[PDB]
Amino acid sequence: SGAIYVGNYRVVNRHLATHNDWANLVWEDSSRDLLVSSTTAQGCDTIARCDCQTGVYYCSSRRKHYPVSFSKPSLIFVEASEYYPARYQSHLMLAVGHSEPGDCGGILRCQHGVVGIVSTGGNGLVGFADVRDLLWLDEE
Numbered sequence: 376s377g378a379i380y381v382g383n384y385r386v387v388n389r390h391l392a393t394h395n396d397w398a399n400l401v402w403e404d405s406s407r408d409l410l411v412s413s414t415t416a417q418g419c420d421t422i423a424r425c426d427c428q429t430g431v432y433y434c435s436s437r438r439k440h441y442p443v444s445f446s447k448p449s450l451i452f453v454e455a456s457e458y459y460p461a462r463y464q465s466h467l468m469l470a471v472g473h474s475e476p477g478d479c480g481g482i483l484r485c486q487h488g489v490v491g492i493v494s495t496g497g498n499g500l501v502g503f504a505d506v507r508d509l510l511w512l513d514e515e
């Protein structure tokens with residue numbers, strides 16, 4: 376599990392999105408596994424506007440932050456998880472690391488701030504849903 380809190384906006388994996396998230400929807404995309412919902416109390420995180428391929432992610436199926444090199448956001452054949460079938464996911468940045476289903480929502484961060492959240496995990500690869508192209512989060 377896990378969310379980003381960029382102001383009064385909560386960023387989560389679309390597949391972990393709660394009834395409250397859907398009842399306070401702002402934007403969602405199934406091909407990315409992203410959804411953003413409105414909050415009443417403000418959060419403590421900032422989004423990265425950059426082309427970094429290095430950072431640190433949180434891996435809940437280990438309780439560790441791991442430093443990683445990660446691939447640029449792309450259309451990636453993911454395969455059967457507990458929460459999706461085998462399929463392509465868009466804007467998925469890839470790194471070599473531990474990612475099980477429940478790791479989803481772990482933050483990937485660089486020197487520029489939050490890069491994205493864990494979305495995918497298979498064959499010793501962790502996949503992150505990029506949020507860097509979503510420029511509209513910082514304002515409004």
Ligand SMILES: O=C(NC1CC1)c1ccc2c(c1)OCO2
Nearest residue numbers: 451452453454469496497498500
């Ligand atoms: O190891 C993977 N998981 C599923 C095969 C079981 C995996 C397969 C294809 C990918 C990928 C990850 O990231 C870029 O495209």
Ligand SMILES: [Zn+2]
Nearest residue numbers: 425427485487
């Ligand atoms: Zn960066």
